[PDB]
Write a protein that binds this ligand. Structure first.
Ligand SMILES: C[S@@+](CC[C@H](N)C(=O)[O-])C[C@H]1O[C@@H](n2cnc3c(N)ncnc32)[C@H](O)[C@@H]1O
Ligand SMILES: C[S@@+](CC[C@H](N)C(=O)[O-])C[C@H]1O[C@@H](n2cnc3c(N)ncnc32)[C@H](O)[C@@H]1O
Ligand SMILES: O=c1cc(N2CCOCC2)oc2c(-c3ccccc3)cccc12
Ligand SMILES: O=c1cc(N2CCOCC2)oc2c(-c3ccccc3)cccc12
Ligand SMILES: [Cl-]
Ligand SMILES: [Cl-]
Lengths: 435, 435
C-alpha cells in the first residue's frame, strides 16, 4: 500500500507524484525545478526529433522521473535508499503506460557503467554534494565529466558552500569547479531549498552540444579562459562569461567582456556596406554570460601560423587586411585591436579580422595607425620596400594619418624613396621600442 | 644539435628514430611493440578509411609517434620531461613532412582535456604504472575509461606486480583491473622489458568498437562476467574469456567456456538441415579468449520478459520451441540447457534458442525431457491442458521419451484425458520438487 511506503520514507523529500495529500509534507514542492526541466527536455527532444532516454541520479521519490515519463520519456531512476525506490515502483505501477524503471544503486557505480548513447539527458539534482562530502572534489569532477561524455545534456542542481550547514565546509569554493572541465555549461536558474535562504544554482551542461534556447546543435570541437569557442559543421559559437568563478574576472573585466560582445552583436547584425562580415545565426546575453553564433570562416588564425612557423605571404596578408581596414574607415569604422590572434588567413593567403568586439565608431586615428606599425613588425626587422612604406607615413603631417592613406602608400611602396638613404631614421627605433 | 640533446636524456629509453648509432644504448629496441602497433594502426585506418589521429601518452623519445607519422598518421606526443620532448622536436625537424607535435604535459591533465573525436587511437605504453604509484588505482581506472570514451581504440602496455621492483607492490593484483570497466579489451601480445624476466601484457581496448583482426565495427551497446555481448547494427559479437583475472574462473570453468564456444562455432558453421540458425559473420579463439560474431536476432530474452513481468503467449512460445527441439532431434541434435535465459521471443511470440554451446550430438534423452518439464513449470502451477500433457508423457515407457513425442503430445494436449481425474498424481510433485 502506498500510505505505508510513504510513511516509511526517512524523508518525504519531494512531492509524491499524483498524490497531493502529501504536498504539505514534502520538503520541496518541485514545481519550479520541474517547469525548467520540462522546457529543457522539450528543447532537446525537439532537436533530436524524438522522445528522450532520461537518467535521474538520486531520484528520491521519483517525481521528476514520473513527470518526464508522463510526457513520453523513457526514464531510469537511481537511488541508494530502498525506501525511496519502493515508493518509485509503487507510483510507476499506478501509471503502467509510463516507461519508467527504478534501481537501488550508487551513483558512482552507475556512472562507471554507463554507455554513451544509452541516455540522452541525465539529471543530478542536489545529490553530488553528498559524493563530494565522501569522495572529494577530483573524483566528483571525473564522475561529472564521464556523465557529460556519455549523454547529450546534463542538468545539475548543486549545493554551495554558502549554505549554513557543517557539510558546506567540504564544498568547492564555487560550484562551477565541479563542471568547468566540461565543454559547455550555462546557468539556467536558481532554486530555494527550504533549508536556508541560500539558493542552489541549476546548470545545463554538455560535452557534445551547444544548448542555447534558440540554437541546439552538436559541435565537433571546442577551445578557449572566460571565452569559449564551439565549432560545428558550419558555425562557430562564441561564448562569453561575464560571471566567472573565483578571482578570475575583475568588475572591469566582466564589463569589458559584456561590452565587447554586445558590440560584436551590434556590428554584425548591421554591418557596414563595403565590408564582408560573417553572418549571425543566433545571439543572446544574460546576467552571467552572452553568446554569438556565426557562420564559420575557413583558414587558420595568424598567431598559430606564426607560432607553428608555417609559411606566410605577408604581401597578401597585409594588403587584404589593409583593404578591409580602409573600407571600414570609409564607413566610419575602426578596429581597436588588430593583432595576429584576431586575424584569420584563408588558403589563398587572404586575411580577415575575426574579433569585432573591438570595433569603434568614434588625433583620430593616429594611435591605431601607430600600433598597426607594430603589428607589421611582429608579422616580421623590415626589409625594403616595407621600411620605405613606413618612412613615407612618418613624413606625413599627423592629421593625415589614417587607413586610406596607409593602404594607398602600401600599394605604391615599390615606388617610394629608399628609407635607408635618408637621416632617416628615428621611426625605426620608435616602433621597435614599443613591440 | 641532436648529440647533445640525446646525451642530456636522463635515460635513452627508446631507439632514437632514424639514428641507429644509439640502438646499442637504448633500454628497449621497440621493434616488437612497433610491429604489433603498426598492424593495429593499419586495421583501424582501413576500417575508418583514412589516416588516423594518434595520441602517444608518455611518448619518451618519440619513437612510436615518429614511426606512425612516417606511415601518414597525425600524431601528438606527450611527456612530462622537457629533455624527452626536446629530443622529439629535434627528430620531427629532421622529418619535416611528418605531421607530428610534441608537448610537455602531464598525462592526467591531458586526458581531462581530451575531446571525443580529436584522436582515433591512443597509446599508453609503460606509463600508467607511474600514475598508479602516485594517484592510486581508482583514479587510473577513471582516466583509462575517459581515454577509451574519447577515442576509437586504446593500446596499453601495462607493468605488473610480478615484476621484482619495490613499485610492483602498489600495482593491482592483475593489470586487467585497470581496464575491465572498459567495454572491449583483448590481450594482443606480451613484451620483454629488459628489466627482468617478467613480460608486460599489451592490451587493445575500446568503448566504441569491436576490434577483432577480422571484424572491426562500431557497436552501439554491450552487456554481460566472463562472457560479453556487443550489439551493432546487424550483429551480436559474443566474446568469451577463458583467462580471467583473480579467482574468477576455475580450471574447470575456463575449459567449459572454451568447449562451449568451440562447440557453438562448430554447430553454427555447419547447422543441421531443417533448423534455422543465426548466420556466422566471424569467429576465432586464442589462449585467453574466443569470439563469435553472428547476425543479430530480433526480440527479447524470455528471462527478461518474465522478470520485467511483460505479457507472454505460452502456447506460441512452447510450440515454436518444441518444434525446433523436435527438428533438432530428428537430425541427431539436442540442447543440454533449455532455460528462459537461452530463449528469445520475437514480436509474434515465436521463440528460438540462442545459446548453442550446449548443443550435443550423443536412457537418452530422458534427462533433457525431464528438465524441460521444469522449464515448463518455471514458464508458469500447471493448468489443464498443460497438466494433461505432462501426465500423458509420464505414462509412456521411458525408452519412448524424446522430443518428437513431447511435441506430438503437446499438439494434441486438448484431447488428452484429464490428469486430475486419475490417481494421478506423483509426477506433479516430482517436477515441483526439482524447480
Ligand atoms: C537531497 S536529495 C535530492 C533528491 C532529488 N534528486 C531531488 O532533488 O528532488 C538526495 C537524494 O540522493 C540519494 N543519494 C544520495 N547519495 C547517493 C548515491 N551516492 N547514490 C545514489 N543515491 C544517492 C538520497 O537517497 C536522496 O534521495
Ligand atoms: C617507462 S617510459 C615509457 C616510454 C614510452 N611510452 C615507451 O614505452 O616506449 C615512461 C615515460 O612516461 C613519462 N611519464 C611518466 N609519467 C608521466 C606523466 N604523469 N605524464 C607525462 N609523462 C609521463 C616518462 O617521462 C617516461 O618517458
Ligand atoms: O570563423 C572562425 C573560424 C575559426 N577557425 C575555423 C577552423 O578551426 C580553427 C578556427 O576560428 C574562429 C575563431 C577562433 C577562436 C579560437 C581559435 C581559433 C579561431 C574566432 C572567431 C571565428 C572563427
Ligand atoms: O541475437 C541476439 C539478439 C539479442 N538481443 C537483441 C536486442 O538486444 C537485446 C538482445 O541478444 C542476444 C543474446 C543476448 C545476450 C545477452 C542479453 C540478451 C541477449 C545472445 C545471443 C544472441 C542475441
Ligand atoms: Cl549537489
Ligand atoms: Cl604501465
Amino acid at each position: 500500500d502506498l500510505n505505508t511506503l510513504v510513511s516509511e520514507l526517512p524523508e518525504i523529500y519531494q512531492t509524491i507524484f499524483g498524490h497531493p495529500e502529501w504536498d504539505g509534507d514534502a520538503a520541496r514542492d518541485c514545481n519550479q525545478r520541474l517547469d525548467l526541466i520540462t522546457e529543457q527536455y522539450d528543447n532537446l527532444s525537439r532537436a533530436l526529433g524524438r522522445p528522450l532516454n532520461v537518467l535521474d541520479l538520486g531520484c528520491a521519490q521519483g517525481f521528476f522521473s514520473l513527470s518526464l515519463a508522463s510526457k513520453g520519456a523513457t526514464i531510469v531512476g537511481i537511488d541508494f535508499q530502498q525506501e525511496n525506490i519502493n515508493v518509485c515502483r509503487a507510483l510507476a505501477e499506478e501509471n503502467p503506460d509510463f516507461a519508467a524503471e527504478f534501481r537501488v544503486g550508487r551513483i558512482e557505480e552507475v556512472i562507471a557503467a554507463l554507455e554513451e548513447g544509452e541516455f540522452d539527458l541525465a539529471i543530478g539534482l542536489s545529490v553530488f554534494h553528498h559524493i563530494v562530502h565522501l569522495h572529494g572534489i577530483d573524483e566528483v569532477k571525473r564522475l561529472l565529466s564521464r556523465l557529460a561524455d556519455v549523454t547529450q545534456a546534463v542538468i545539475l542542481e548543486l549545493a554551495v558552500k554558502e549554505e549554513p550547514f557543517y557539510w558546506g565546509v567540504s564544498q568547492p569554493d564555487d560550484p562551477r569547479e565541479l563542471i568547468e572541465q566540461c565543454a559547455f555549461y550555462r546557468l539556467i536558474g536558481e532554486f530555494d531549498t527550504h533549508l536556508s535562504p541560500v539558493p542552489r544554482p541549476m546548470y545545463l551542461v554538455s560535452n557534445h552540444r551547444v544548448l542555447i534556447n534558440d540554437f541546439n546543435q552538436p559541435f565537433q570541437h571546442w577551445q578557449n579562459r572566460s571565452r569559449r569557442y564551439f565549432f560545428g559543421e558550419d558555425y562557430v559559437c562564441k561564448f562569453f562569461y561575464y560571471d566567472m568563478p573565483h578571482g578570475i574576472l575583475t568588475a572591469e573585466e566582466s564589463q569589458r567582456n559584456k561590452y565587447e560582445l554586445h558590440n560584436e552583436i551590434k556590428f554584425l547584425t548591421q554591418p557596414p556596406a563595403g565590408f564582408d562580415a560573417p553572418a549571425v545565426l543566433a545571439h543572446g546575453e544574460n546576467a552571467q554570460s552572452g553568446w554569438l553564433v556565426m557562420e564559420k570562416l575557413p583558414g587558420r588564425l595568424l598567431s598559430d601560423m606564426l607560432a607553428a612557423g608555417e609559411e606566410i605571404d605577408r604581401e597578401k596578408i597585409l594588403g587584404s587586411l589593409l583593404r578591409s581596414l580602409a573600407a571600414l574607415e570609409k564607413q566610419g569604422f575602426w578596429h581597436d585591436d588588430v593583432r595576429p590572434w584576431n586575424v584569420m588567413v584563408d588558403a589563398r593567403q587572404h586575411a580577415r579580422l575575426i574579433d569585432f568586439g573591438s570595433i569603434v565608431t568614434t588625433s583620430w586615428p593616429t594611435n591605431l595607425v601607430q600600433s598597426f606599425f607594430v603589428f607589421v613588425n611582429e608579422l616580421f626587422n623590415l626589409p625594403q620596400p616595407w621600411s620605405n612604406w613606413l618612412y613615407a607615413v612618418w613624413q606625413e603631417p599627423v592629421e593625415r594619418w589614417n587607413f586610406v592613406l596607409l593602404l594607398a602608400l602600401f600599394e605604391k611602396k615599390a615606388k617610394l624613396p629608399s628609407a635607408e638613404q635618408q637621416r632617416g631614421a628615428t621611426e625605426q627605433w620608435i616602433i621597435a621600442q614599443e613591440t
